[PDB]
Design a protein around this ligand. Structure first.
Ligand code: SF4
Ligand code: SF4
Ligand code: FES
Ligand SMILES: [Mg+2]
Ligand SMILES: [Zn+2]
Lengths: 86, 77, 96, 115, 690, 48, 208, 125
């Protein structure tokens, strides 16, 4: 229930990652200034698919696919994870 | 050098054990003949090919000259 | 130059000797440990240094073809003796 | 097409038929092997061992591989029937002097480095 | 385009102008015999072994130095070429000593092999041989100069690659000798490489002498962990023992060379090793125990506590697999106090963006820059091969180098702006001439050393360097993808730990002192028992007895980098893997296996059971850790720079002083090199000549 | 050897030994090299 | 050039080349290649399907009369898609000549048995089956010849280890010989011997 | 006629290899690195397949080096990477492939040793 880290795996030039890329290019910084003590690790995937990882207390974590999402979709799912839902 | 020696080839006619035994005894006699010829015609000279990339050099040369030591080392390793 | 160890085991010229806690020592019970008594380091140290009147000397170990490959040794360093890499014999130039 | 030629069987059905014939022959032979070699095992143990060997190669899906396995099994049966094998050869299937090795991670970690 | 057509034995080849005969021959797979030519050194042309006949020409040419011409037909196997080779080999062997049985070069000698392949099989030399006196150039390179063939490879390497002009030739004619003409040690961070370049047994390794033959050795290709360069190496082992370390060619990283520590620190692994688990007895003394007992004690202590009460510190030689295993294990306890000894600023972007803590230009990119700014670093000793690349660029591309910090000797001429950090702001405000110089630089580089980030004002220094890179990007525009910003690391484990989410620095431990502390090869002495509460449980896992082991309650013997297949990430960001050369001694085990066994003992069993499953977990956490030669990545300099300008902490009025000011501080830096007797000999030799 | 004596050397045995197998003096093989890996010795003083 | 170098014979080279052309002309359905080595040995590379016809021709042809099978063995080259190379050496007493016939197979492709042509083949094929695992169809009695009873694997394959996988000893608890995984007190020591310099320019391969 | 099998080649059941030395082994497919002590390149032409290193221990009686794995000396030669990959796949071994490392072409100029204004001029010969 207690979020500890966020991991975003986005591919460098795959089309399906484009929206995710856009998000990092536009609205990552604001998020970082909203949660200045929260690890948001941005890493690169191989040719498979985008992914978002959310880790919680005591080692529990789950992942949500960000394939073909736009920037609005990734913002929506991210603020869904940061809030006490889903 | 088997083209330079004279000997006969024993031949059987029955194809049985006895003929093969006779052939082997006669081949021993022919071997004595060939050995006599080889003893009389042994020539002088070296006993391995004079090519140090194949045959090892003599010990005296191996302890004297650089190329001989190199070739001895490489041929034995 | 064979010396003994605290357990009494003889020390080889390579310096090998079992420790007190080592169980392998049991292999020498009722038997003996084979040790060669002629330490080559001391024997070659016993040989006198040859003095020659040339900057370069040659060594083949003695006996001609029954020795080692013939090598040439430089004797320019005054405060050192030239040593054969095969035999261990030492050569120098007359000094003082 | 992949253009491959057969050994004996055209597809997996004929291969399975040959497997069943070989299994029948081995099952029939087991009691004679127990009697002739003077084995201390039971007939049930021998038939279970026979069953175990067949199960090991159960996964194979290629008819040529199955054909070769059946050929090897027939060769082994011929060796056994003619008493070309000795008692040691028959008992080698049972690994009676090999100490058991645990498959758990902790047991392997304790004993050594091998995975 | 401009390609010209030549012929090798009648076979047509298209080559660029300026290509030599040897390179044209190489294109069709024909290797010309050589002794003095090295493709990474200046052309000499003195050995004369490369003579080849050009069709319709009466004089043979030196293939290594002669450019090809249009329509030339190179005859590599003609009578003239073979006779030239035989004559040159005869001249080379006339005065060579009969030393092969006692020469360490035997079995891997270019002289021996080329005599076998291109020379005669016998001698007609009926005179006496020359003998020259030996030279002393230090405790690393053994010298027997009667074997010298005067190819001058060592001199050219020393002048060109190492920047040291101590080597030369004295006399002339048959009496010409290679040396220093005075008693002087050729002491350099790259000196040992002259053993490799020397084609004969004239120069050899002193620690390696008389121990092995090349045909005996088994070769394992792996990676070096003595710094963050990630040099590719070959490990030579015989009958379960590590015999020596050799360079392995990687054009992008080290490309033929290794540093002296990388080459001679293998000696340390043979002593002060942890071989068995240890606990504390009734008298507070460390006593050998079984794996079960130590693991049970650690598991009970770990089940006792939870959260902030558990912490871990990762040392400088830890691999990615063990790091992720320990992170998962401490996460199961709901602990997030996973730290490294090396400090990186955490404000702003921090570790969120990879480019914030990487050498983004990459090691190869140094060959394309025209200006490089060095800030608070000593690249010569922190990253010797990176400094070698800088010198290569300085020599061949007329690269301009400027340094901010103490005036160290870098083996090339550089401009010294100063040592105060205020200069950074002066370059960030545009009130410095070097700001103008950077403005007109179309391929500029700024490199900030990790050792300069260890002071309290490291965050402000990073912010100032980011401001300089910002002004470069703004004034000069965007040059495509050049990645001006750069961070130079010195610890092999730092980049992987940052990738996995470890907290850089040890401050979190100081702020919340734990009751259970894990020391994963941590030997920097950053935290002692004074910084921790009494009766604190300390666990050390490693391979050497050093700073960390005597203070621990339980000792868990691990494997060294030569004893496992493990992942290490470059200061570039490139992930590479080592291979097993020998197995861990005694009862020591693979580190991730130790952590997994402990997790199973403690009740929180980790999912992975094999190495492949641990690497799958690594891919889950950070997918770049399983791409084993990739170095390309995205650049997020804009976001990191924007996040770096909201904290305005101030600089300190203290000069930037690198931790290693001279060569003596180079040899012993980590646990393995501190246990090495060869490094101790090097320290004694550099502190006093004698 | 009475008319053709062998060359004298200071290291040649002065007393021949026959085959000693099956006796206490028999040869026993052993490794002639020293220890390869040196272990860490913990300190003898308490740590707290 | 004279004393140490082996002399060459050109009459035999010409005759062998002519006979190779003759055989290739008569049997275009199976002959893929013909070669004459420079020490005067003639080889014919054929498709596997022609094992029986070609051999029969060579055995019974009036101008060939290769009525003796000197040797039959296999060579394993793992880099080839068809792993195994089958080699027949034939001798003609009428014309005092020798010929070599080569074909190929893989692990799963049978080769027709040539026992109907040469009786001597009977054991040779068995050996090939034992050492390499190549199956021969229509063999009168195909089984192991060289290895121990129940031996697993084919030891002459390149990927088979030199010391194998099992070793034998006598066990007193079961009072019999038993087999166990191999353990060696001294591991066999691999030597890396090849020189890094090319020896024979006449055999240099194109750089691809 | 033909039967047209549509499976993947798999000969592990016929090679006689024990199961442990099939599933737990990792093979490496690579072009060997040139020995840095010599300039010859003739040993960097072919592909090599080798097995992962296992434990070696000292023999108690003579101190010799003892092993328990039978594949410690097995090294295979291949013309191409694809051939080695196919062999490893059909033998059931899991493998790691390393791309061939080729030295990049270099621009050599003997005249540059004596440049009028560049740093490439040599101070000694
Ligand atoms: S350098 Fe080479 S040729 Fe000279 S002695 Fe040593 S091994 Fe022999
Ligand atoms: S010491 Fe070695 S590298 Fe230097 S000139 Fe002599 S042979 Fe060449
Ligand atoms: S290699 Fe060309 S002269 Fe030496
Ligand atoms: Mg050398
Ligand atoms: Zn001597």
């Amino acid at each position: 229930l207690g979020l500890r880290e966020i991991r975003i795996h986005l591919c460098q030039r795959s089309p399906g990652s484009q929206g995710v890329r856009d998000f990092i290019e536009k609205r990552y910084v604001e998020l970082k200034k909203a949660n200045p003590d929260l690890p948001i690790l941005i890493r690169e995937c191989s040719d498979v698919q985008p992914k978002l990882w959310a880790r919680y207390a005591f080692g529990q974590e789950k992942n949500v696919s960000l394939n073909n999402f736009s920037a609005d979709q990734v913002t929506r799912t991210l603020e869904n994870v940061l809030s006490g839902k889903a | 050098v088997y083209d330079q020696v004279e000997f006969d080839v024993p031949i059987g006619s029955r194809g049985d054990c006895y003929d093969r035994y006779l052939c082997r005894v006669e081949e021993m006699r022919q071997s004595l003949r060939i050995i006599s010829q080889c003893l009389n015609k042994m020539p002088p000279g070296e006993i391995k090919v004079d090519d140090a990339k194949v045959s090892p050099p003599k010990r005296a040369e191996m302890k004297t000259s650089m190329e001989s030591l190199i070739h001895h080392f490489k041929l034995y390793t | 130059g064979v010396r003994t160890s605290p357990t009494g085991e003889k020390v080889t010229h390579t310096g090998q000797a079992y420790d007190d806690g080592d169980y392998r020592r049991v292999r020498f019970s009722d038997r003996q440990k084979e040790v060669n008594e002629n330490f080559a380091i001391d024997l070659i140290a016993e040989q006198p240094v040859s003095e020659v009147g040339s900057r370069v000397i040659s060594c083949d170990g003695g006996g001609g073809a029954l020795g080692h490959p013939r090598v040439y040794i430089n004797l320019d360093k005054e405060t050192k003796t030239g040593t054969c890499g095969y035999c261990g014999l030492q050569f120098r130039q007359p000094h003082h | 097409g992949t253009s491959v030629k057969p050994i004996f069987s055209r597809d997996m059905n004929e291969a399975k038929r040959r497997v069943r014939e070989l299994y029948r022959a081995w099952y029939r032979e087991v009691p004679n092997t127990v009697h002739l070699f003077q084995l201390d095992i039971s007939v049930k143990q021998g038939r279970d061992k026979v069953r175990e060997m067949f199960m090991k190669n159960a996964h194979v899906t290629d008819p040529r591989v199955v054909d070769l396995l059946v050929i090897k099994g027939k060769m082994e049966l011929e060796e056994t029937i003619n008493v070309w094998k000795q008692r040691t050869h028959i008992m080698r299937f049972f690994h009676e002097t090999e100490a058991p090795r645990p498959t758990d991670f902790l047991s392997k970690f304790y004993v050594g480095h091998d995975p | 385009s401009n390609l010209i057509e030549v012929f090798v034995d009648g076979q047509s080849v298209m080559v660029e102008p300026g290509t030599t005969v040897l390179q044209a021959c190489e294109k069709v797979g024909m290797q010309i015999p050589r002794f003095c030519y090295h493709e990474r050194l200046s052309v000499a042309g003195n050995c004369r072994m490369c003579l080849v006949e050009i069709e319709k020409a009466p004089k043979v040419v030196a293939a290594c130095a002669m450019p090809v011409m249009k329509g030339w037909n190179i005859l590599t196997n003609s009578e003239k070429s073979k006779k030239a080779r035989e004559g040159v080999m005869e001249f080379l062997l006339a005065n060579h000593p009969l030393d092969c049985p006692i020469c360490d070069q035997g079995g891997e000698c270019d002289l021996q092999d080329q005599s076998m392949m291109f020379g005669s099989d016998r001698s007609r030399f009926l005179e006496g041989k020359r003998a020259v006196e030996d030279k002393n150039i230090g405790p690393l390179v053994k010298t027997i100069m009667t074997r010298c063939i005067q190819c001058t490879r060592c001199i050219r390497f020393a002048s060109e690659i190492a920047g040291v002009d101590d080597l030369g030739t004295t006399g002339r004619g048959n009496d010409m000798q290679v040396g220093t003409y005075i008693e002087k040690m050729f002491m350099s961070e790259l000196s040992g490489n002259i053993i490799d370049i020397c084609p004969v047994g004239a120069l050899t390794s002193k620690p390696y002498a008389f121990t092995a033959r090349p045909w005996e050795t088994r070769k394992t290709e792996s990676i070096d962990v003595m710094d963050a360069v990630g040099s590719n190496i070959v490990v030579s082992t015989r009958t379960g023992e590590v015999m020596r370390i050799l360079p392995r060619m990687h054009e992008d990283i080290n490309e033929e060379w290794i540093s002296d520590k990388t080459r001679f620190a293998y000696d340390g692994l043979k002593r002060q090793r942890l071989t068995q688990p240890m606990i504390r007895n009734e008298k507070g003394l460390l006593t050998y125990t079984t794996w079960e007992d130590a693991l049970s004690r650690v598991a009970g202590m770990l089940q006792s506590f939870q959260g902030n009460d558990v912490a871990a510190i990762a040392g400088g030689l830890v691999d990615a697999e063990a790091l992720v295993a320990l992170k998962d294990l401490l996460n199961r306890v709901d602990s997030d106090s996973l730290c490294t000894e090396e400090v990186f600023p955490t404000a702003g972007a921090g570790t969120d963006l990879r480019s914030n803590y990487l050498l983004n230009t990459t090691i190869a990119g140094v060959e394309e820059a025209d200006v490089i700014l060095l800030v608070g670093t000593n690249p010569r000793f922190e990253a010797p091969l990176f400094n070698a690349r800088i010198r290569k660029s300085w020599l061949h591309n007329d690269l301009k180098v400027a340094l901010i910090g103490s005036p160290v000797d870098l083996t090339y001429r550089y401009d010294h702006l100063g040592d105060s950090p205020k200069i950074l702001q002066d370059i960030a405000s545009g009130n410095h001439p070097f700001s103008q110089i950077l403005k007109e630089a179309k391929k500029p580089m700024v490199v900030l050393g990790s050792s300069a980030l260890q002071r309290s004002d490291g965050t402000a220094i990073l912010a100032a360097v980011s401001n300089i890179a910002q002004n470069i990007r703004l004034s000069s525009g965007v040059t495509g993808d050049w990645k001006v910003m750069n961070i130079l690391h010195r610890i092999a484990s730092q980049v992987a730990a940052l990738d996995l989410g470890y907290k850089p620095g040890v401050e979190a431990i100081r702020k919340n002192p734990p009751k259970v502390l894990f020391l994963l090869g941590a030997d920097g002495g950053c935290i002692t028992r004074q910084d921790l509460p009494k009766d604190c449980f300390i666990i050390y896992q490693g391979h050497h007895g050093d700073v960390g082991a005597p203070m621990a309650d339980v000792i868990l013997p691990g494997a060294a980098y030569t004893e496992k297949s493990a992942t290490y990430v470059n200061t570039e960001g490139r992930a590479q893997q080592t291979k097993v050369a020998v197995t861990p001694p005694g009862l020591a085990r693979e580190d991730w296996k130790i952590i997994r066994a402990l997790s199973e003992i403690a009740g929180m069993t980790l999912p992975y059971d094999t190495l492949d499953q641990v690497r799958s977990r690594l891919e889950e956490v950070s997918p770049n850790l399983v791409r084993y030669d990739d170095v390309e990545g995205a650049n997020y300099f804009q976001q990191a720079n924007e996040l770096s300008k909201l904290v305005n902490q101030q600089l300190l009025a203290d000069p930037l002083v690198p931790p290693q000011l001279t060569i003596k501080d180079f040899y012993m830096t980590d646990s393995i090199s501190r246990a090495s007797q060869t490094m101790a000999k090097c320290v004694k030799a550099v502190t006093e000549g004698i | 050897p009475t008319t053709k004596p062998p060359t004298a050397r200071k290291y040649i045995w002065t007393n021949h030994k026959f085959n000693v197998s099956g006796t206490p003096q028999q040869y026993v093989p052993y490794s002639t090299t020293r220890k390869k890996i040196q272990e860490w010795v913990p300190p003898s003083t308490p740590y707290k | 050039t004279r004393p140490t170098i082996r002399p060459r014979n050109d009459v035999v080279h010409k005759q062998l080349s002519a006979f190779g052309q003759y055989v290739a002309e008569i049997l275009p359905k199976y002959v893929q290649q013909v070669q004459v080595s420079c020490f005067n040995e003639l080889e014919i590379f054929i498709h596997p399907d022609g094992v029986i016809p070609v051999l029969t021709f060579l055995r019974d042809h009036t101008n060939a009369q290769f009525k003796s099978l000197a040797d039959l063995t296999a060579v394993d080259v793992p880099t080839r898609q068809n792993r195994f190379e089958i080699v027949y050496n034939l001798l003609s007493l009428r014309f005092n000549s020798r010929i070599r016939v080569k074909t190929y197979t893989d692990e799963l492709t049978p080769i027709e048995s040539s026992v109907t042509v040469y009786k001597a083949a009977n054991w040779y094929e068995r050996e090939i089956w034992d050492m390499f695992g190549v199956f021969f169809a229509n063999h009168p009695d195909l089984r192991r010849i060289l290895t121990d009873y129940g031996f697993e694997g084919h030891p002459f394959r390149k990927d088979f280890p030199l010391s194998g996988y099992v070793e034998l000893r006598y066990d007193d608890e079961v009072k019999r010989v038993v087999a166990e995984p191999v353990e060696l007190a001294q591991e066999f020591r691999k030597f890396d011997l090849n020189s890094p310099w090319e020896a024979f320019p006449a055999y240099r391969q194109p750089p691809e | 006629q033909l039967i047209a099998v549509d499976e993947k080649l798999d000969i592990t059941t016929l090679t006689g290899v024990p199961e442990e030395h099939i599933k737990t082994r990792k093979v490496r497919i690579f072009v060997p690195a040139r020995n840095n002590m010599q300039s010859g390149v003739n040993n960097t032409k072919k592909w090599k397949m080798e097995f992962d290193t296992r434990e070696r221990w000292e023999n108690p009686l003579m101190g010799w080096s003892s092993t328990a794995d039978p594949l410690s000396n097995l090294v295979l030669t291949f013309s191409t990477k694809e051939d080695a990959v196919a062999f490893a796949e059909k033998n059931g071994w899991s493998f790691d492939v390393e791309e061939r490392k080729v030295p990049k072409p270099k621009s050599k100029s003997y005249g540059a040793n004596f440049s009028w204004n560049k740093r490439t001029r040599v101070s000694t010969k």
